Amino acid sequence: HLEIPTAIKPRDGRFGSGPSKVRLEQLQTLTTTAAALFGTSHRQAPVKNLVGRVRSGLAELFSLPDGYEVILGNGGATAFWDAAAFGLIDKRSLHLTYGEFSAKFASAVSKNPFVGEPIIITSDPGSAPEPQTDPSVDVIAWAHNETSTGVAVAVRRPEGSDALVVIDATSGAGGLPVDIAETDAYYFAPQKNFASDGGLWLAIMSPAALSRIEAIAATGRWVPDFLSLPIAVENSLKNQTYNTPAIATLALLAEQIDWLVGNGGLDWAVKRTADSSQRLYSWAQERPYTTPFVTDPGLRSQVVGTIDFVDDVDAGTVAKILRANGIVDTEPYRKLGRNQLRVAMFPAVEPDDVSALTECVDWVVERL
Amino acid sequence: HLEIPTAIKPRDGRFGSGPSKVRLEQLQTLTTTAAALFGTSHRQAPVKNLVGRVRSGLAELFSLPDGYEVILGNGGATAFWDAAAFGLIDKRSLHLTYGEFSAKFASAVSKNPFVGEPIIITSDPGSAPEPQTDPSVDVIAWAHNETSTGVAVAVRRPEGSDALVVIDATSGAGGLPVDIAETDAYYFAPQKNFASDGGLWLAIMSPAALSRIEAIAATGRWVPDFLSLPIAVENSLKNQTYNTPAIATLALLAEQIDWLVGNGGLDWAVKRTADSSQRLYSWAQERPYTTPFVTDPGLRSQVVGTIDFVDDVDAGTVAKILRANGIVDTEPYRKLGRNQLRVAMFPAVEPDDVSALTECVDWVVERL
Numbered sequence: 001h002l003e004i005p006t007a008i009k010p011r012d013g014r015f016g017s018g019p020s021k022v023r024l025e026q027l028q029t030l031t032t033t034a035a036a037l038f039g040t041s042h043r044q045a046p047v048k049n050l051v052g053r054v055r056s057g058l059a060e061l062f063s064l065p066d067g068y069e070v071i072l073g074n075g076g077a078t079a080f081w082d083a084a085a086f087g088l089i090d091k092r093s094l095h096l097t098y099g100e101f102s103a104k105f106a107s108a109v110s111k112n113p114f115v116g117e118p119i120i121i122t123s124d125p126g127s128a129p130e131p132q133t134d135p136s137v138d139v140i141a142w143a144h145n146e147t148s149t150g151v152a153v154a155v156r157r158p159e160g161s162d163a164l165v166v167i168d169a170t171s172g173a174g175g176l177p178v179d180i181a182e183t184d185a186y187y188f189a190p191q192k193n194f195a196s197d198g199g200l201w202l203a204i205m206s207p208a209a210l211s212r213i214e215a216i217a218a219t220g221r222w223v224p225d226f227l228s229l230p231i232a233v234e235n236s237l238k239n240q241t242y243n244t245p246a247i248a249t250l251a252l253l254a255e256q257i258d259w260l261v262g263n264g265g266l267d268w269a270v271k272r273t274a275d276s277s278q279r280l281y282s283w284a285q286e287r288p289y290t291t292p293f294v295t296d297p298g299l300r301s302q303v304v305g306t307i308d309f310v311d312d313v314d315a316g317t318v319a320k321i322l323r324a325n326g327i328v329d330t331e332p333y334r335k336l337g338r339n340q341l342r343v344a345m346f347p348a349v350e351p352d353d354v355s356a357l358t359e360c361v362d363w364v365v366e367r368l
Numbered sequence: 369h370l371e372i373p374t375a376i377k378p379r380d381g382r383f384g385s386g387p388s389k390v391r392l393e394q395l396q397t398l399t400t401t402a403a404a405l406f407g408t409s410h411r412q413a414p415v416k417n418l419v420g421r422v423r424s425g426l427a428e429l430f431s432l433p434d435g436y437e438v439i440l441g442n443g444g445a446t447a448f449w450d451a452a453a454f455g456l457i458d459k460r461s462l463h464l465t466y467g468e469f470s471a472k473f474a475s476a477v478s479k480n481p482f483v484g485e486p487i488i489i490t491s492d493p494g495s496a497p498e499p500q501t502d503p504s505v506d507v508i509a510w511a512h513n514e515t516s517t518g519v520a521v522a523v524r525r526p527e528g529s530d531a532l533v534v535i536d537a538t539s540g541a542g543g544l545p546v547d548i549a550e551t552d553a554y555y556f557a558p559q560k561n562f563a564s565d566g567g568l569w570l571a572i573m574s575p576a577a578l579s580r581i582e583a584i585a586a587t588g589r590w591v592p593d594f595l596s597l598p599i600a601v602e603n604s605l606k607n608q609t610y611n612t613p614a615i616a617t618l619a620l621l622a623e624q625i626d627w628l629v630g631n632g633g634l635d636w637a638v639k640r641t642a643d644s645s646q647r648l649y650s651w652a653q654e655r656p657y658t659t660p661f662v663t664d665p666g667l668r669s670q671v672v673g674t675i676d677f678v679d680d681v682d683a684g685t686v687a688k689i690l691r692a693n694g695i696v697d698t699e700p701y702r703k704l705g706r707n708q709l710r711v712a713m714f715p716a717v718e719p720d721d722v723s724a725l726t727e728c729v730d731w732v733v734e735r736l
């Protein structure tokens with residue numbers, strides 16, 4: 001057992017990529033300012049107003065253009081994938097795949113017997129293909145941030161895609177820049193940049209997406225009610241979800257949105273994650289035992305940093321020692337199979353704590 | 369405005385039937401003994417051990433027979449209906465319907481194109497048909513407690529059913545008696561007797577149900593991954609869910625389970641809800657402007673009490689005045705259309721508060 005000196009440790013040891021650091025004062029709202037909301041009806045004003053705070057707050061944070069709406073429903077982003085397969089894809093989609101999450105949505109669409117066989121454009125993990133389109137598709141899909149690899153991809157409507165742009169922003173939303181007008185469905189869950197819990201999905205949708213949802217419904221295509229985007233939309237527009245949402249999840253999410261907006265909005269959040277990730281990547285470049293997994297700097301995520309270790313330094317051992325010292329969730333994505341650490345740098349994470357983390361890793365490695 | 373005197377008011381004004389009263393000392397564990405779990409990985413030991421506590425606690429509380437397992441996944445009970453339609457029903461089901469929730473499961477199954485047309489046995493709201501079977505079905509389904517009507521139904525395996533017994537216990541589980549051996553899937557969500565949040569479903573499953581899930585999967589039947597019972601089972605057995613669960617929901621749930629077990633278990637909870645409900649129904653009988661909606665006393669739920677009001681006393685006005693005085697969520701189920709109050713009496717609700725509620729109703733009614 002190596003005991004890392006307290007003086008060099010981060011103030012908060014949570015570097016997980018979802019769930020992720022929930023701020024002390026943010027968690028504290030659950031027993032204070034939100035306490036009276038708990039255990040009260042999602043069909044009555046107090047909880048509906050909370051949903052309204054979330055919707056209005058996200059609309060401000062993301063500078064929603066006219067006609068865009070915040071849609072929400074239980075289940076988390078994984079549920080949204082199945083909902084989108086039923087409800088947003090008409091005939092066929094094109095997917096970019098370059099890691100666990102981008103691949104899994106494509107796979108979900110491939111198996112779903114209500115839509116066509118998707119075009120899948122792949123790259124190796126640590127890279128990404130360019131956003132692109134095809135004449136045969138009506139949805140083009142990729143991930144803003146591939147949480148498994150630490151790759152961030154530009155969110156721009158490809159030339160000649162006059163198709164809905166459907167973006168998995170689960171780990172990107174709230175920490176990376178975005179022009180929402182380039183998107184038609186920009187979806188996420190609360191447990192990354194929003195510093196809340198899983199079990200709810202949120203989707204910012206364009207008028208084109210909303211009209212598409214309505215059109216697909218009018219074909220008679222079956223969808224299980226729980227995965228129904230039509231039903232989610234009708235409820236969301238009246239500050240509700242189809243079935244009962246978690247009040248804690250909404251409360252923590254509202255507090256984080258308010259904090260982000262109060263600190264200067266998405267531009268502040270992006271500067272923050274830039275500060276943090278600059279510290280991580282500069283350190284990884286400086287040390288001879290580390291290197292960023294992502295070789296193209298233009299793809300290096302500000303919010304999830306994947307740092308490979310050379311052969312003779314065992315990152316698994318480093319992660320274990322960190323964990324035993326209260327510095328947690330630096331293990332790489334469980335399926336990736338590399339000698340690597342993965343470090344989250346969502347806005348709740350203090351840039352100084354990322355600096356501290358790197359000093360802790362140096363201290364450990366010197367003593368292996 | 370009528371200002372109800374403080375001296376006659378309940379200590380806690382939450383009488384909603386889901387979400388429902390969350391005890392303060394329970395909520396306070398989020399900021400103390402559970403605080404370090406927030407924002408940490410559901411694929412690492414601390415949160416897995418929390419899931420383990422929920423599963424083992426439920427196994428104790430419900431006296432699970434050998435081979436029964438606690439299965440869980442995101443989405444709430446409404447998600448479970450769709451998962452069950454895909455994953456538990458082989459060819460055909462029989463449903464009893466007698467209110468919103470029992471009817472909604474039947475409707476979900478009717479529309480699902482992967483199974484046959486269900487047999488539906490109906491009664492008027494306020495009543496229920498008898499648990500029963502049919503030679504052409506392989507699942508028999510009803511609700512332990514129909515939250516929309518205040519009707520509780522026996523949970524017994526019908527004679528000749530030698531079919532899976534699939535019971536919607538969303539508002540019954542934890543507050544009504546049950547012999548789990550009479551069931552094959554006894555499912556619920558945390559926001560009623562368990563005094564936690566929505567967005568998670570739990571299902572106690574028999575060996576027969578688990579083998580059925582496996583057999584259906586082995587046919588190659590497609591299911592969206594989010595609604596996959598095979599996947600939920602695989603994860604549940606290793607203290608996980610398919611996708612990211614809410615730590616607050618699990619933490620509040622675990623605390624409530626521990627509280628129930630520590631007080632004497634299900635037997636204690638049932639004595640408590642009997643005490644509360646006796647106060648409500650006896651009051652309703654005593655007053656000339658009230659009567660229990662459910663005329664058969666054997667169907668009168670111990671946990672959700674529906675009290676009709678005579679024409680000349682406007683229960684809507686009563687509910688509004690109660691609400692304005694902090695006594696909330698006594699409105700009847702939004703779709704039922706009756707001059708009625710609906711009062712929840714789950715174990716977190718103190719019996720003396722139900723008595724206080726009745727005194728508050730009398731005080732208001734005398735001044736209308």
Ligand SMILES: Cc1ncc(COP(=O)(O)O)c(C=O)c1O
Pocket residue numbers: 018075076077078079101102143145146147148168169170171189198199611612
């Ligand atoms: C990019 C991405 N997409 C989808 C998911 C699935 O999220 P959830 O667990 O909320 O379903 C995740 C994992 O959290 C993710 O990082």
Ligand SMILES: Cc1ncc(COP(=O)(O)O)c(C=O)c1O
Pocket residue numbers: 243244386443444445446447469470511513514515516536537538539557566567
């Ligand atoms: C008996 C019953 N079944 C199903 C549901 C659906 O529950 P959820 O909102 O968790 O999907 C409810 C409503 O909460 C209910 O009372």
